């Protein structure tokens, strides 16, 4: 059974630019994803000032359905970005059976961030929780701050890339990297 429980948590706050960027990234993600009649269930969740849910995990059964759902969930704005709340609300309120989650077959959590960790305590608690439950966490960084010089964006996103103690090459990716998405699927083939 090549099925698995996947959740994608996106932010559309003021730190994020035109939603066409993330929908294009999600487009390429879902395109490469093998969403068959009963395999690869992907739920899209949006966060910011709160966590909104538009679609459920088992609300679709085709690449086309999930692809349309991904570009259908457009965030018009967000007062703030709370990365820690995105991870928290995903493993409970998105990975719940009533929301279309399975019996716990390969819990994949993909989250995007720009660099705004105002509280490392909440995210570390969710991290240690998902680490004990051996959840496959993937963090993608989006660059959209224009960059008016070498301000060292590496020192801004470093806070989120340190979430995973495992190799960053299989956990931390970029929106402008399509091979990153391939790296996810190839390593998702394993049990962990």
């Amino acid at each position: 059974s090549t099925q698995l429980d996947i959740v994608i948590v996106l932010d559309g706050s003021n730190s994020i630019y035109p939603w066409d960027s993330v929908t294009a990234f999600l487009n390429d993600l879902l395109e490469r994803m093998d969403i068959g009649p009963k395999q690869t269930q992907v739920g899209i969740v949006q966060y910011g000032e709160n966590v909104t849910h538009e679609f459920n995990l088992n609300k679709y059964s085709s690449t086309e359905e999930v692809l349309v759902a991904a570009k259908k969930i457009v965030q018009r704005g967000g007062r703030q970005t709370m990365t820690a709340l995105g991870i928290d609300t995903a493993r409970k309120e998105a990975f719940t059976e009533a929301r279309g989650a399975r019996r716990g077959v390969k819990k994949v959590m993909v989250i995007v961030t720009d660099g705004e960790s105002h509280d490392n305590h909440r995210l570390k608690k969710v991290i240690q929780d998902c680490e004990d439950e051996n959840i496959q966490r993937f963090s993608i960084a989006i660059l959209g701050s224009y960059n008016r010089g070498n301000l060292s964006t590496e020192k801004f996103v470093e806070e989120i890339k340190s979430i995973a103690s495992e190799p960053t090459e299989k956990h931390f990716f970029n929106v402008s990297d399509e091979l990153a998405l391939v790296t996810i699927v190839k390593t998702l083939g394993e049990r962990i």
Partner: peptide, 21 residues
């Protein structure tokens, strides 16, 4: 002429100042 749409949003604020001794 019809006006355009809202411009691009602002980026995250700068890091806070160092704490006291």
């Amino acid at each position: 002429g019809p006006p355009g749409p809202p411009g691009l949003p602002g980026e995250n604020g700068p890091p806070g100042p160092p704490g006291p001794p």
